[PDB]
Design an enzyme around this catalytic site. Structure first.
Site, mmCIF file in Angstrom:
data_model
loop_
_atom_site.group_PDB
_atom_site.id
_atom_site.type_symbol
_atom_site.label_atom_id
_atom_site.label_comp_id
_atom_site.label_asym_id
_atom_site.label_seq_id
_atom_site.Cartn_x
_atom_site.Cartn_y
_atom_site.Cartn_z
ATOM 1 N N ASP A 1 0.846 -1.429 -0.029
ATOM 2 C CA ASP A 1 -0.107 0.013 -0.123
ATOM 3 C C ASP A 1 0.878 1.404 -0.075
ATOM 4 O O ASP A 1 0.569 2.366 0.599
ATOM 5 C CB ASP A 1 -0.894 -0.094 1.268
ATOM 6 C CG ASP A 1 -2.028 1.018 1.129
ATOM 7 O OD1 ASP A 1 -2.429 1.353 -0.205
ATOM 8 O OD2 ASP A 1 -2.730 1.287 1.925
ATOM 9 N N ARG B 1 0.129 9.190 0.145
ATOM 10 C CA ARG B 1 -0.730 9.412 1.560
ATOM 11 C C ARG B 1 -0.030 8.550 2.586
ATOM 12 O O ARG B 1 -0.339 8.875 3.934
ATOM 13 C CB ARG B 1 -1.910 8.890 1.144
ATOM 14 C CG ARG B 1 -2.203 7.529 1.121
ATOM 15 C CD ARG B 1 -3.741 6.924 0.853
ATOM 16 N NE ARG B 1 -3.744 5.557 0.068
ATOM 17 C CZ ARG B 1 -3.721 5.240 -1.273
ATOM 18 N NH1 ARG B 1 -3.700 6.390 -2.052
ATOM 19 N NH2 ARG B 1 -3.455 4.103 -1.597
ATOM 20 N N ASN B 2 0.615 7.595 2.535
ATOM 21 C CA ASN B 2 1.386 6.271 3.362
ATOM 22 C C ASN B 2 2.829 6.741 3.781
ATOM 23 O O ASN B 2 3.408 5.855 4.200
ATOM 24 C CB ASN B 2 1.152 5.060 3.070
ATOM 25 C CG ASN B 2 -0.488 4.816 3.177
ATOM 26 O OD1 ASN B 2 -1.227 5.457 3.980
ATOM 27 N ND2 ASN B 2 -0.918 3.762 2.157
ATOM 28 N N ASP C 1 1.262 3.267 7.658
ATOM 29 C CA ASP C 1 0.392 2.217 7.309
ATOM 30 C C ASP C 1 0.646 0.869 6.694
ATOM 31 O O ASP C 1 0.821 0.803 5.484
ATOM 32 C CB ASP C 1 -0.618 3.139 6.184
ATOM 33 C CG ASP C 1 -2.074 3.038 6.147
ATOM 34 O OD1 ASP C 1 -2.491 1.759 6.190
ATOM 35 O OD2 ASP C 1 -2.762 3.889 6.590
#
Ligand SMILES: */C=C\C(=O)Nc1ccccn1
Ligand SMILES: [Cl-]
Ligand SMILES: [Cl-]
Ligand SMILES: [Cl-]
Length: 304
Positions: free
Chosen positions: A139, A143-144, A157
């Site tokens: 992932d 954003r992570n 994350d």
């Protein structure tokens, strides 16, 4: 047999820490942690499940806790400990500037080539470390990645992170199609090399100051577009040198993609001469009670 995982999982009393305010909605809080019997205050993010009356939700958060406890690298988020109140709480290092996705969106105008390329290096080091640890993130996305300072980012994350074993097999969920390797969308095959595909996309997000990959293209279509050989376009600031690295991460043959170790090397060479490799308007002209016993988590080490 594999090597035993001798990571320590620290259990914290709820009284060791203070929620200072809410960052997101379970609910992430900004707070402060006093390790029991130590004269230190540690800025923390406290991730608290809302109800947790969901046995499902509890497995998810403890899997995250399992992985974050077993990683120790300057470019990956570690767990300081967990708290087993009604609601299970993860305590981790506060990353005060938020996600690099929000950070580059918000600061498009103040971010020069030196910061972008150093970020590409640090995420490559984070990701190579995980590979050394036989961990597939599954992932990786802008954003992570979280911002400790503008000079220092960390992969976070680990909710979807799995051990390798090559091809990992999955079986459903709400998935990040636009970041995933072709072999992952089609056959649920996930490897360190599927992680290199998403590294590729993550870099395209940074170099476009947080644009949405394949914006206005339905996720149903991505597999066909990729099979037709289409890829994300060359960002305006990118020299062919930088874009060609992104493109190699998006080869159909997983073993033809670069290795995270190679990406470290290629981005470091570029980082020694940033304005040769990224062309940004006004680049040179760019700048980015008791706190007495406060220590960043990175200066807070317990015996190994
Ligand atoms: C790397 C630690 C971590 O994930 N911290 C965090 C999460 C959310 C907001 C701020 N800091
Ligand atoms: Cl796991
Ligand atoms: Cl460097
Ligand atoms: Cl200790």
């Amino acid at each position: 047999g594999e090597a035993p995982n001798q990571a320590l999982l620290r259990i914290l009393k709820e009284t060791e820490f203070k929620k200072i305010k809410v960052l997101g909605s379970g609910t992430v809080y900004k707070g402060l942690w006093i390790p029991e019997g130590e004269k230190v205050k540690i800025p923390v993010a406290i991730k608290e499940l809302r109800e947790a009356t969901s046995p499902k939700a509890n497995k998810e958060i403890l899997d995250e806790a399992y992985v974050m406890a077993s990683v120790d690298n300057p470019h990956v988020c570690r767990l300081l400990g967990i708290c087993l109140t009604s609601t299970v709480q993860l305590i981790m290092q506060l990353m005060p500037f938020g996600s690099l996705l929000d950070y580059v969106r918000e600061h498009k105008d103040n971010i020069g080539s030196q910061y972008l390329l150093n970020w590409c290096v640090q995420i490559a080091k984070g990701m190579n470390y995980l590979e050394d640890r036989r961990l597939v993130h599954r992932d990786l996305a802008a954003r992570n990645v979280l911002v400790k300072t503008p000079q220092h980012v960390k992969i976070t994350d680990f909710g979807r992170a799995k051990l390798l074993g090559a091809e990992y097999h999955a079986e459903g969920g709400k998935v990040p199609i636009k970041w995933m390797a072709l072999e992952s969308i089609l056959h649920r095959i996930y490897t360190h090399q599927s992680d290199v595909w998403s590294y590729g996309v993550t870099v395209w997000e940074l170099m476009t100051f947080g644009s949405k990959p394949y914006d206005g293209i339905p996720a149903s279509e991505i597999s066909s577009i990729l099979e037709k050989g289409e890829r994300l376009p060359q960002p305006p600031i990118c020299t062919i040198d930088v874009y060609m690295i992104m493109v190699k991460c998006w080869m159909i043959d997983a073993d033809s993609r670069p290795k995270f170790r190679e990406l470290i090397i290629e981005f470091s060479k570029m980082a020694r001469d940033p304005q040769r490799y990224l062309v940004i308007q006004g680049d040179e002209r760019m700048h980015l009670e008791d706190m007495d016993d406060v220590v960043d988590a990175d200066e807070y080490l317990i015996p190994q």
